[PDB]
Ligand binder design. Structure first.
Ligand SMILES: COc1ccc([C@@H]2Sc3ccccc3N(CCN(C)C)C(=O)[C@H]2OC(C)=O)cc1
Ligand SMILES: [Ca+2]
Ligand SMILES: [Ca+2]
Lengths: 219, 228, 219, 219
């Protein structure tokens, strides 16, 4: 019976099945939004999700006594194991933040299609060489986030009242969200010189992300 | 009669005549925008529309009698057809939008003028060299558009009321438009943990698009070498 | 005498001398922008300006003697010409910009100095490569501008009232400057489908801009 | 006795003793941030820092002997001398921004750890190749930065008062921060053709900003 179930799971049709059904829940989760549909077609939907989730649980189980060691030595499987388990945690308890986390099974659709796997890995390909740069960036912030909190955060706390408030803002500025009228002009009107912070900060921090796509296109 | 009309079509005149009308109608359309004009020199242009449309409607039939089966298997032709024909839509009734789609006719400057046709072909070449990632986004976007509506849109109705409003808002944040003060800071006053739906939804967005583009440079770069 | 006026001009002294006048008139006008400086030194500095032109005026007469027709067959020189053709014009009457166009002079730091010439004409040299596209956009821009203008200029005339409005507003959206909340959500208050003009327009324009750079990068 | 102090300073323990101190006093200054942490355990914060500055002024006097002439001709040390010197000023009088610089030391985690040094110099490196077109633009940003002050400074004072106020603004227009509604849309009410002034400017400053980026990609 070991090899009967091995053919079962690894078949074209078990794939087409699970992929058809990832697609389906992914239209019903669409329609769940509709707060009218939830009156008209409400109940079909709520247990459709339980119907589909068990299938996935067994699809996960069927996969596991086949591969064994092999299964959890795959990132995409593990994430599927991770994702559908996230949904096995009950609707009650914990936080709602578990109810809405659930909808990460649509990433399952991604892992299910090998074309997505091909391209998604190209995207994760690129990351590590940037860990060099990436994790300096993550300190320039820390250093410069602190300077702000003490400098401003008395008078302008929403923005820099805090280690973490300074971060959220310095990010804000990094992306040049609405930093000009929104964030320095109002400061200078109290602390006239804080342009010696940000114009510098804006310089370092666009520079780096520029010499990021340069040295991204060498790999 | 075929090779007689097959001569009216291909002539250096007929293209220089059809094209030079496009320009001559652009100007014309650049003046249907003051009210001043439609007052004084109004019906003047009202029917100059009606002229340059007949000139095309016929022309498409001429090429259809030349190329025929060849005509509906070229993109640039199929466009001129569609775009002329959509102008054939009637002035009265219909929909007020179809009355405004007209100045798409000014796209035949692309289609007739040769150098503009070439760039378009260049520019449309990159498309499927990305079309996986184009999808990967709308899936990702989708999984993130629900997630928004069932979190925020209860309180914050305009921004995240529906699938629709969530997507559009989630686009806004992509261009990095007003996003922090304008959309998220507000979310933080009721929901201090929204910088977890967003500072990430950011990097992911701007990791991809950067790779979407280093692709464009790469696929376009990839074609250059390796021929030795 | 022709071959003295050739020698006076060609000297490595002459250039240094010209570049000295510019880089003074450069410093001098920084101080002209000030409010207080023109109280005190508004005597000398209104003098000094009128010399620096008188001299460059001579320089053009001589350099024309030297190269004759080769003068108005050279870009860089014509720029020196028309920039100085401006400053001559008397101080009062007509438009107030001709008295500000004065500062256009300072760009003689570029023409005069080789390696400013080179990197400037290195920039400009891609424009011929870009006609093939600027053409197309100004066709695209002009075309949406018409549609925008009829469709919205009735309820939103400060923004889409004429062509002019529509162009700048469309020029805005292209810089993703406050397009959404600023310009479009207000439009969705009255014309709900504007996300189908404004998004897609927004797509295309950036599309181009990327592929613009992906052939500037081969070129 | 000279080569005994030259055979510890160079070792891999003396080094990891700073890099670890760095990382502790690095962690400590983010705890200062907490207002709760300053009236609970502020004592060990004041001292830990106090000891660190002892260790570091010792370290630096220790590396001066081993290195001497090799020391005061290195970037990373002239950095480290001043970056630490700053924390030794009396802390009374002067300016309170003396006291804030004290966190520029946590930059040393970059100095004293070699991968960061080669990732950091991988950016300073491609800076002498750019200081050309940093000249061309800083020229433009001046020339206009005059006109702006003298086309809109009597009435549009905040944004364009002083020469400076023209700088801080045009940069915001350059960063494309809120420019159109923020800045141009308002000027246009009083002076209508300000788009002619600004809009071109926003071609020049971004074209150059794009090609100067291409000049990075082949070199
Ligand atoms: C954190 O680092 C960042 C921050 C922001 C960006 C945005 S991403 C974006 C999203 C959608 C359309 C375009 C953009 N572009 C490209 C086109 N744009 C230049 C006109 C950007 O450059 C960035 O926007 C700007 C001008 O800051 C990129 C990296
Ligand atoms: Ca803004
Ligand atoms: Ca903006």
């Amino acid at each position: 019976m070991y090899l009967r179930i091995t053919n079962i799971v690894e078949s074209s049709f078990f794939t087409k099945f699970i992929i058809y059904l990832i697609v389906l829940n992914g239209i019903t989760m669409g329609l769940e939004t509709s707060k009218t549909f939830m009156q008209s077609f409400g109940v079909y939907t709520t247990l459709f999700n339980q119907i589909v989730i068990t299938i996935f649980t067994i699809e996960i189980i069927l996969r596991i006594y086949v591969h064994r060691i092999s299964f959890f030595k795959d990132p995409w499987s593990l994430f599927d194991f991770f994702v559908v388990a996230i949904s096995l945690v009950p609707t009650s308890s914990g936080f709602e933040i578990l109810r809405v986390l659930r909808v990460l099974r649509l990433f399952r659709l991604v892992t299910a299609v090998p074309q997505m796997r091909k391209i998604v890995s190209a995207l994760i390909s690129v990351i590590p060489g940037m860990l060099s740069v990436i994790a300096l960036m993550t300190l320039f912030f820390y250093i410069f986030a602190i300077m702000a909190t003490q400098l401003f955060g008395e008078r302008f706390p929403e923005w820099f009242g805090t280690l973490g408030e300074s971060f959220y803002t310095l990010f804000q500025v990094m992306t040049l969200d609405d930093w000009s009228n929104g964030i320095v002009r109002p400061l200078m009107e109290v602390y006239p010189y804080a342009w010696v912070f940000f114009i510098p900060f804006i310089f370092v921090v666009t520079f780096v992300m520029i010499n990021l796509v340069v040295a991204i296109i060498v790999d």
